[PDB]
Tab-separated table of C-alpha atoms in Angstrom:
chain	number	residue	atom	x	y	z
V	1	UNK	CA	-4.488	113.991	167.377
V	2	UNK	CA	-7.515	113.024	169.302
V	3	UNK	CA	-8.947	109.679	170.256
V	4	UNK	CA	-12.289	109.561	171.844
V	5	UNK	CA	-12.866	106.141	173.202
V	6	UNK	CA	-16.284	105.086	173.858
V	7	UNK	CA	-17.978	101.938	175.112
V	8	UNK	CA	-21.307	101.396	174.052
V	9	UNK	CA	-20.678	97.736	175.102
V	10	UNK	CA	-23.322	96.358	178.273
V	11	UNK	CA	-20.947	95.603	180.016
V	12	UNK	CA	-17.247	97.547	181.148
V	13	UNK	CA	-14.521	96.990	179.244
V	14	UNK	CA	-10.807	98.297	179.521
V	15	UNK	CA	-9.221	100.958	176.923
V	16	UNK	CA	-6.322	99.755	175.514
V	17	UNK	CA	-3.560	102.042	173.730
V	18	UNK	CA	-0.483	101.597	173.114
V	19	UNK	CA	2.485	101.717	170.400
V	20	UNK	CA	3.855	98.427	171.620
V	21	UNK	CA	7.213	99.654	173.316
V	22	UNK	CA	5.262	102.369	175.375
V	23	UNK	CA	1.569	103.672	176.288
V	24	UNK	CA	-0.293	106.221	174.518
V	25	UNK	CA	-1.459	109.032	176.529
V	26	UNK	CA	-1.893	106.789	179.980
V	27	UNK	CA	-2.551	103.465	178.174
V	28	UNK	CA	-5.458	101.987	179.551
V	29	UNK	CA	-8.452	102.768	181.535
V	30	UNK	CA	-11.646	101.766	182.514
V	31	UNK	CA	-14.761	102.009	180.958
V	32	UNK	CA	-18.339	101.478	182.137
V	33	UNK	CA	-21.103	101.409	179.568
V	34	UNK	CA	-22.130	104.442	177.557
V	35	UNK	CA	-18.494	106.000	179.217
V	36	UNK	CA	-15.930	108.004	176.735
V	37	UNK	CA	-12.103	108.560	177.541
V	38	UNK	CA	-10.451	111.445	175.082
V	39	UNK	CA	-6.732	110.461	174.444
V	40	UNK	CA	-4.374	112.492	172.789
V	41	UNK	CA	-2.076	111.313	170.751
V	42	UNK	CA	1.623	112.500	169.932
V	43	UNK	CA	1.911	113.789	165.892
V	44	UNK	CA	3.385	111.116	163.719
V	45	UNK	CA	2.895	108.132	165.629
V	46	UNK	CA	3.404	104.943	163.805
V	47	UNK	CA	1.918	101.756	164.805
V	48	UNK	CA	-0.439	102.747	167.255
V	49	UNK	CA	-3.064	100.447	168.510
V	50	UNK	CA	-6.062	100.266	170.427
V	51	UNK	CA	-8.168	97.606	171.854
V	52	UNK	CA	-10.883	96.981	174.648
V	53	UNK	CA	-10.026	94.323	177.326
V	54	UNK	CA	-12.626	92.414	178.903
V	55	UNK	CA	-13.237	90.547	182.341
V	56	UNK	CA	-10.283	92.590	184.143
V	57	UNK	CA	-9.598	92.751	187.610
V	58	UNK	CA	-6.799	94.992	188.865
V	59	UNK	CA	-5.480	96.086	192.241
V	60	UNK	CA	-5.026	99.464	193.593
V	61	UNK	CA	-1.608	99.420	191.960
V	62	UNK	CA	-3.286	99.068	188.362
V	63	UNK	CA	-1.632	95.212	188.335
V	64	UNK	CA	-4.301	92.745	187.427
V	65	UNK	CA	-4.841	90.140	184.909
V	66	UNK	CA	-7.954	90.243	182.084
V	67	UNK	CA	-8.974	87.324	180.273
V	68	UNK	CA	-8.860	88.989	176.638
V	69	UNK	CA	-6.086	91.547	175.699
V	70	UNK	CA	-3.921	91.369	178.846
V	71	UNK	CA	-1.175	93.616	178.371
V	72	UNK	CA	1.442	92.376	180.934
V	73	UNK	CA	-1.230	92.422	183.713
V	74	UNK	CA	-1.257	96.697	183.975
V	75	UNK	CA	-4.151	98.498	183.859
V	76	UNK	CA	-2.133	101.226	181.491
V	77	UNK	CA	-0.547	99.076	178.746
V	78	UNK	CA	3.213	100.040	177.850
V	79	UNK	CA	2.470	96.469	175.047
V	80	UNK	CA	0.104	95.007	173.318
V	81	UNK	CA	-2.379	92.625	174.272
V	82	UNK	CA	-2.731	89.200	174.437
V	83	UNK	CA	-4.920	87.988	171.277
V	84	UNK	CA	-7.569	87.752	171.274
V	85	UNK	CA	-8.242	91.710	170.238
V	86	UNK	CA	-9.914	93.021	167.951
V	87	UNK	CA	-7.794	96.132	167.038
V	88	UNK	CA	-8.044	99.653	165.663
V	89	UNK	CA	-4.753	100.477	164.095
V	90	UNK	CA	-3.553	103.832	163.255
V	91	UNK	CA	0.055	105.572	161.909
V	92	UNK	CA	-0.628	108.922	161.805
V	93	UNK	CA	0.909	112.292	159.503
V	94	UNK	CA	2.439	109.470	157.348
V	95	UNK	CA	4.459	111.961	154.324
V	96	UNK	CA	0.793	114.047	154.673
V	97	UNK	CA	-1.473	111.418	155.296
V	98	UNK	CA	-2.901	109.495	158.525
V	99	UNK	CA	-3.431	105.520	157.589
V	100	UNK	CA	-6.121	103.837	159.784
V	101	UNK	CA	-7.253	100.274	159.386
V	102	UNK	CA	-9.147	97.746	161.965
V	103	UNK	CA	-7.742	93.640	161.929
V	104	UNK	CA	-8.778	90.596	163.204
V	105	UNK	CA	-4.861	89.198	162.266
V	106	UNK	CA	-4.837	88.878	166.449
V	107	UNK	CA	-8.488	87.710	166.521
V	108	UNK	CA	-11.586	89.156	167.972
V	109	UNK	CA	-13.099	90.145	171.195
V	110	UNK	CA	-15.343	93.054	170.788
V	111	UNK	CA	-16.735	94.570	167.596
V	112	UNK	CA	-15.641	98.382	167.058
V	113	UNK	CA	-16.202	101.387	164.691
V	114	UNK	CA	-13.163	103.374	163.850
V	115	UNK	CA	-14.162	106.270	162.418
V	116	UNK	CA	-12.471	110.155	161.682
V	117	UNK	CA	-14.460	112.826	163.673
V	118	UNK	CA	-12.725	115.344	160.722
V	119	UNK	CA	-14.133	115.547	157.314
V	120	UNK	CA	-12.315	114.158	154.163
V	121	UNK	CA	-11.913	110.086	154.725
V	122	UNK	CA	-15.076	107.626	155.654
V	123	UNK	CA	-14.493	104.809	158.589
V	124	UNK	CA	-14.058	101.509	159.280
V	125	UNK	CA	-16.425	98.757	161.534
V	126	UNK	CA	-16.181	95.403	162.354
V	127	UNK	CA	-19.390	94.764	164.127
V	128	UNK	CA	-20.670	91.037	163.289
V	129	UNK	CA	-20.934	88.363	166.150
V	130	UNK	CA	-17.655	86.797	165.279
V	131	UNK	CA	-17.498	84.815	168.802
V	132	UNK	CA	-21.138	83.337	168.565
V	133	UNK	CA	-20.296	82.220	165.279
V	134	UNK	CA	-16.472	81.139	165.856
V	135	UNK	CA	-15.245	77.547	164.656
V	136	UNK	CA	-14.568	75.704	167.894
V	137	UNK	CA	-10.829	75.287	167.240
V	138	UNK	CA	-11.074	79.384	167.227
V	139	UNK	CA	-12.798	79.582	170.544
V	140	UNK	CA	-11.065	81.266	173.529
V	141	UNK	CA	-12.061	80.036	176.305
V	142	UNK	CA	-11.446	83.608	178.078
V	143	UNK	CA	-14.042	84.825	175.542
V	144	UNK	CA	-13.002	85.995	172.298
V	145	UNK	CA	-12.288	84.046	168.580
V	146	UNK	CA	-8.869	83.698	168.276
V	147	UNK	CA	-6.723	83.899	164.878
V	148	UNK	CA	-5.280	80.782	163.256
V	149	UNK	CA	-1.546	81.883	164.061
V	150	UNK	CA	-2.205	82.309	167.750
V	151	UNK	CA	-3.784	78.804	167.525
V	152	UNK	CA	-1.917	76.569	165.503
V	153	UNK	CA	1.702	78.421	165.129
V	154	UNK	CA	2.273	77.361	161.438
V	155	UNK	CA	4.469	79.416	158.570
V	156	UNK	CA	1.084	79.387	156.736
V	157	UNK	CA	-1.093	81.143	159.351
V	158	UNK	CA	1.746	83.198	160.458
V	159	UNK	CA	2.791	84.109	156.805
V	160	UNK	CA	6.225	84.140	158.637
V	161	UNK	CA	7.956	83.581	155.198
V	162	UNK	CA	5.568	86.604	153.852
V	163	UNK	CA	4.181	84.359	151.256
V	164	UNK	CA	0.950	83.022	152.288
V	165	UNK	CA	-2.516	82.494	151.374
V	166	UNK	CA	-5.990	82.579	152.410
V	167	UNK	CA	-7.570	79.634	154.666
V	168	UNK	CA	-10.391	78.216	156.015
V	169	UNK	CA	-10.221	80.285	159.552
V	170	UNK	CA	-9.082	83.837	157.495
V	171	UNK	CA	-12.124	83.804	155.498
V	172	UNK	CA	-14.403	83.013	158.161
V	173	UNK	CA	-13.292	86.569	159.918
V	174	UNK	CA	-13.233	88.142	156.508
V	175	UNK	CA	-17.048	86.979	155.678
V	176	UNK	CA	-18.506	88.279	158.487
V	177	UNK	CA	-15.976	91.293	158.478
V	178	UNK	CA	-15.143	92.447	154.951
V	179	UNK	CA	-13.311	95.363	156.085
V	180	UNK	CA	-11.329	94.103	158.059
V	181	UNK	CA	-7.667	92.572	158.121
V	182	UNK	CA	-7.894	88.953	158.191
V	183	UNK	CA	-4.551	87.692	157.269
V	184	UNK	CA	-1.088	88.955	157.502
V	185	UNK	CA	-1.279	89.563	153.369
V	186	UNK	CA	-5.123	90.093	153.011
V	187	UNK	CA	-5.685	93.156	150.158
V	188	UNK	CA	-5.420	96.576	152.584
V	189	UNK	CA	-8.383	97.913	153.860
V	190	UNK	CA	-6.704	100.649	155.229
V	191	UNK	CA	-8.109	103.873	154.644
V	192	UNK	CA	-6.352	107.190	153.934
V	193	UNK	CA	-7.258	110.210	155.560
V	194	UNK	CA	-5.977	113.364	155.719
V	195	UNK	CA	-3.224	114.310	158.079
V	196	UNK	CA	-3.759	114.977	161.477
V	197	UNK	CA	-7.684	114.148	161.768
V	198	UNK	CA	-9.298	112.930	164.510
V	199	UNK	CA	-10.948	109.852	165.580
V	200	UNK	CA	-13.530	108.148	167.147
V	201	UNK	CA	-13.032	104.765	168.448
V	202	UNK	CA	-16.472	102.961	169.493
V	203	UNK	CA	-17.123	99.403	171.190
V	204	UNK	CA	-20.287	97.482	170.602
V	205	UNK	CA	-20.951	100.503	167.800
V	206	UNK	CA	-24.247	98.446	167.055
């Protein structure tokens, strides 16, 4: 399948992609405003992600550090970042179907679209000012609006029993971003398209 990537941020961020225990396509690069990157992306991949970085300084060796979805310090991420990220999600020619969602369970750094460039499912955004408007405890300092769990570590944030509820920091993501994940057990938003479409993935879509 294909991923175009594009930043329509003001200001360079760094591609993200990865299905946690190895990169998709090269895994990360660099992108200057109004710049795309097409990725390709194996056939029934399960669990992919991607995510922009920002504030990222690398070496020539691609080892670096960025302030908001660090992935082990490369420049082509074999892992996922370090919260916060906002994060297009994607398992693809699922029994027939491709399954594409964007969360906010690992908080927010830059809004995105995530949206088929095929015909026969609709797309996804998440495109409010979550970090101007995030509740002080949320705050990154790195930039960003960090997720309860990351925060506070509790069962109830974490839903690390799997039963778990709504709170006071999940429904602040999920009123300014409806469709989007906002909690481990929030009501899907994932939407089905058909097998093997293809997909735009846009930064700062607004």
């Amino acid at each position: 399948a294909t991923f175009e990537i594009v930043n329509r941020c003001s200001y360079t961020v760094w591609a993200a992609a990865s299905k946690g225990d190895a990169a998709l396509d090269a895994g990360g690069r660099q992108l200057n405003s109004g710049e795309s990157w097409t990725i390709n992306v194996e056939p029934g991949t399960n669990g992919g992600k991607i995510w922009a970085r920002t504030d990222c300084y690398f070496d020539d060796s691609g080892s670096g550090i960025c302030k908001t979805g660090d992935c082990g310090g490369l420049l082509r991420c074999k892992r996922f970042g370090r919260p916060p990220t906002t994060l297009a999600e994607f398992s693809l020619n699922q029994y027939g179907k491709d399954y594409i969602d964007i969360s906010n369970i690992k908080g927010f750094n830059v809004p995105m679209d995530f949206s088929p460039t095929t015909r026969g499912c609709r797309g996804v955004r998440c495109a409010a000012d979550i970090v101007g408007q995030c509740p002080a405890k949320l705050k990154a300092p790195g930039g960003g609006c960090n997720d309860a769990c990351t925060v506070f570590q509790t069962s109830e944030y974490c839903c690390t029993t799997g039963k778990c509820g709504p709170t006071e920091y999940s429904r602040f993501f999920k009123r300014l971003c409806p469709d989007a994940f906002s909690y481990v057990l929030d009501k899907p938003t994932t939407v089905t398209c058909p097998g093997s479409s293809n997909y735009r993935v846009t930064f700062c879509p607004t």
